[PDB]
Amino acid sequence: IPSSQEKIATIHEYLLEHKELEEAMFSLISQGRGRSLINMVVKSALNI
Amino acid sequence: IPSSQEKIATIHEYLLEHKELEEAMFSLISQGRGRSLINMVVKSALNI
Incomplete structure (x- = not known):
């Protein structure tokens, strides 16, 4: 169900909380x- | 020199152009x- 806008917004919040990931x-x-x-x-996500 | 806002905006544009990455x-x-x-x-970024 989640839309592209919701996925992008979720990643945006995650990057703000984890600067290492944003910087890398x-x-x-x-x-x-x-x-x-x-x-x-x-590949990592497909191997869940 | 690039700020956090510029880094986030650059990633945002990249995710929009590469939906696989956004979805994964x-x-x-x-x-x-x-x-x-x-x-x-x-780890990948540190091994550049």
Whole structure:
């Protein structure tokens, strides 16, 4: 049921509460490693 | 130099362009696996 806006808002709140995650994601994205970030997080979530 | 607001806004734009990442992060966070998400992304970013 949750919409994309609700998912984004939930992640936004999580990033604010966990600055390490925000800083690590920005570092990976801004340094051109976002594709490795996508692949790694998707694989982890699919193996729940 | 980039501020927290700029980092968050950069991630927001990235999530919108890559729905898989948004969906995988929400799935991990909402199912109580956010700590594993933090640890995995931080380690990857530190090994750049």
